Design an enzyme around this catalytic site. Structure first.
Site, PDB file in Angstrom:
ATOM      1  CG  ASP A  10      67.927  96.799  82.697  1.00 40.32           C
ATOM      2  OD1 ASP A  10      68.110  95.554  82.765  1.00 40.32           O
ATOM      3  OD2 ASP A  10      68.105  97.449  81.628  1.00 40.32           O
ATOM      4  CB  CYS A  37      67.879  83.428  76.268  1.00 38.86           C
ATOM      5  SG  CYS A  37      68.007  82.961  74.523  1.00 38.86           S
ATOM      6  CG  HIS A  75      37.780 108.083  58.970  1.00 37.91           C
ATOM      7  ND1 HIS A  75      37.598 109.329  58.387  1.00 37.91           N
ATOM      8  CD2 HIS A  75      37.883 108.304  60.305  1.00 37.91           C
ATOM      9  CE1 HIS A  75      37.552 110.259  59.325  1.00 37.91           C
ATOM     10  NE2 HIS A  75      37.702 109.663  60.501  1.00 37.91           N
ATOM     11  CB  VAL A 127      41.315 106.027  68.049  1.00 39.10           C
ATOM     12  CG1 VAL A 127      41.876 104.601  68.100  1.00 39.10           C
ATOM     13  CG2 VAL A 127      39.896 106.113  68.755  1.00 39.10           C
TER      14      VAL A 127
END
Lengths: 439, 439
Positions: free
Chosen positions: A117, A147, A246, A383
């Site tokens: 980078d 940009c 849930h 999850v």
């Protein structure tokens, strides 16, 4: 003749090693290109976070950080003048030092993708990096970020530049002023990638018009193909993601794992509270995703909002352990119990799944979340940990232990180069986490 | 209060319809663009085959076929001269007739993507199609195929043009000669998509340099994003795909479904024969994929080739029916047995999967197969039907019934706009298919 490995459950040929057992013991450099404040570092960190989460070891080599360690206290854009011969030389040594670390990461430390980078705005610098890649047998993939909207450059500067250690001694208008002068240092000598002529043969993507136009040239393999797909589905507009489990369900009350049980009466109070909470967030449009297990769907029905069911969001499959309590597991499957505790990410339940499997199956959820605006995901403990690890950049080893109590919303919002998480507990009791019971 | 649907097993709110039950009863046009023989029709058919298989209803509107029905017997490229005022008028009526059918498909027949396959080489024609899309509320996505390599144009002509009904009365050199004159009819007036100026606002992809360079502009949604990803991972180099099941296994001999049993002694003879067969195909490099179930891995081990295990290739999960025989299923789960026979694609086993779930889980396998050269996939009956339906363009309703006997290789090779299948039975006995027993 095959044997099943204890932890991952993979069938492998019996290794009847002879009495002197012998043991056997192509990487990619992604090269960022572009003017300062064009999102290169934001792309580098977020791509790496994605690549590592799907299991490709990746590391960012931010030349700007090598420059911060080599010089200490940045005073001004003068450091970046093309006529600053000393600084030019320091900058080139910073780049070369980062390349030595790239070499080491890919060739000795097991890394598979190094993201280099730096501005890399001249052909001459990119030609040197290609020589480095060719001489080490690394592939090279270039990502150029372009940009031309002053609005977006200004906003990048406000979001990640002015608060940098570089601008420690600085207030906002002067930081902004300095950075603009810094940018203009690079303009005379900047040579964009040109795939129709001089760069015909490079593998690259140019991200243009605020992630709106792409030019893609000579994708070479599977991993590059995944990168491009990813880069084409991320966007910078701020939004919110909410994650929760849930409401408490009847297997929660009996300490039985998995299954497809319904909400308990407290789970339904959570579901009402969640409805109240969503309403006071007061959000434009809010998408709601659930799994296909009953208790997440009941929880969403309390909201009176349209929702979408995903089978990919269903809880990790416990295989033979489905619907056992943790004690029936310990007492019928002591071997299995103990292995899981030893290696919780990689461990797979017999005829069931591991966190590692969860990851592959959630990959399309992550890809679609990137495309969304405001979203609330109502899912299940494993999850949720697996999605949270992706947004908060947690490793595989920490993923299965992230805290996700019942009746608690996690609110994720973008800041600087990542996600801030805020926890909002909705004040409805539930049985505790399994971790808390143990201690 | 929720109920689980009988067939798909989806939790849905009880619909206690009032006594007068009321019932409630954005689409995309993909616009192909390009000179003749640039792959437009090949892209249209193969994209549609992919889209339908993942469950997006899609249909090709090939204006060339509307022209074949309107004129009958093509005699020459003269029909395509820009000074042929009558033919220009017929061509425009063919296009308009195809657009009426697009309108009908998307707005009345449940279709979600219409692929409008015609040259569409002028801005004026593309402007009219955009007016059509705007006036009907359809989105518009353009795919332009650009080819400047005479080698590839010549090869397309030999592969799909000379054998066309157009060239019925023609031999090869004269067909080739006519088609080249046809192409040159379009050259003066051809206006490529130009995303930097006049086409800034269109959603499009230009496929250039033999699928090597892409320009992608303003992808708008989920489905367009999947299209682009797909188009970027297909390639035209000829290769072979082989598909087979694992050798017969011990659950095969007991007529028990699912599980993770090992090869029987005939399964191991199949595995040897498969090894012999692969060797006589005499293939450069051959990739071998298996599932993570034991019997496919044993089958690959007989080959002494490197292979790769995919959990996505594992057999469909039968849920509570795992490891039952077909009679124990009929006698313990008569209701479940009968529903499956009624709706075999959509049916899901309790706590298990449907063919429809298989499809989603195989999508990354299909995407990687597109990227490969020679590949042999050793998998399981339902997985094999599901992959075969994608390569042979079979519908969801026919997919679960495709013939896939044991010990039989399916060899898929490219011809014209699709896949030819050849069956090679390796002469080792096994128990029969379940269909054959029943009748």
């Amino acid at each position: 003749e095959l044997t099943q490995s204890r932890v991952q459950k993979i069938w492998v040929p019996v290794d009847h090693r002879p009495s002197l057992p012998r043991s056997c013991g192509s990487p990619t450099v992604i090269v960022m290109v572009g003017l300062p404040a064009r999102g290169k570092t934001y792309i580098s960190k977020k791509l790496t976070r994605y690549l590592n989460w799907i299991g490709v070891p990746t590391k960012v080599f931010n030349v700007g950080e090598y420059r911060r360690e080599a010089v200490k206290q940045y005073s001004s854009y003068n450091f970046f003048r093309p006529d600053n011969e000393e600084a030019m030389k320091v900058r080139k040594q910073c780049a070369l030092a980062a390349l030595r670390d790239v070499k080491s990461y890919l060739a000795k430390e097991g890394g598979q993708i190094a993201v280099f980078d730096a501005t890399n705005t001249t052909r001459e610098r990119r030609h040197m990096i290609l020589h480095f890649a060719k001489e080490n047998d690394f592939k090279a993939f270039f990502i150029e970020s372009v940009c031309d909207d002053p609005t977006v450059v200004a906003s990048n500067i406000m979001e990640v530049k002015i608060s940098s250690p570089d601008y420690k001694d600085c207030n906002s208008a002067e930081a902004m002023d300095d950075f603009m002068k810094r940018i203009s240092c690079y303009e005379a000598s900047y040579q964009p990638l040109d795939p129709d002529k001089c760069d015909r043969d490079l593998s690259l993507i140019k991200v243009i018009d605020v992630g709106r136009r792409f030019l893609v040239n000579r994708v070479q393999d599977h991993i590059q193909s995944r990168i491009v797909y990813y880069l084409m589905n991320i966007h910078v507009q701020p939004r919110t993601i909410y994650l929760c489990r849930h409401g408490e369900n009847e297997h929660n009350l009996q300490g039985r794992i998995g299954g497809d049980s319904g909400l308990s009466s407290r789970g339904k109070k959570f579901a009402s509270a969640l409805s109240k909470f969503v309403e006071e967030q007061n959000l434009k449009d809010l998408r709601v995703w659930t799994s296909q297990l009953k208790s997440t769907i009941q929880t969403a029905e309390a909201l009176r909002l349209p929702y979408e069911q995903w089978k990919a969001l269903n809880e990790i499959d416990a295989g033979v352990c489905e619907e056992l309590t943790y004690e029936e597991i310990r007492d019928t499957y002591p071997e299995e119990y103990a292995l899981r505790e030893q290696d919780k990410y990689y461990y797979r339940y017999p005829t069931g799944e591991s966190y590692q499997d969860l990851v592959q199956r959630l990959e399309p959820v992550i890809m679609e979340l990137e495309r969304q605006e405001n979203v609330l995901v109502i899912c299940h403990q494993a999850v949720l940990r697996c999605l949270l690890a992706y947004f908060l950049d947690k490793s595989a080893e920490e993923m299965p232990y992230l805290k996700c109590p019942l009746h608690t919303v996690l609110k994720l919002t973008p800041v600087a180069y990542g996600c801030r998480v805020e926890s909002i507990y909705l004040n409805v009791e539930s049985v505790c986490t399994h971790r808390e019971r143990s201690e």
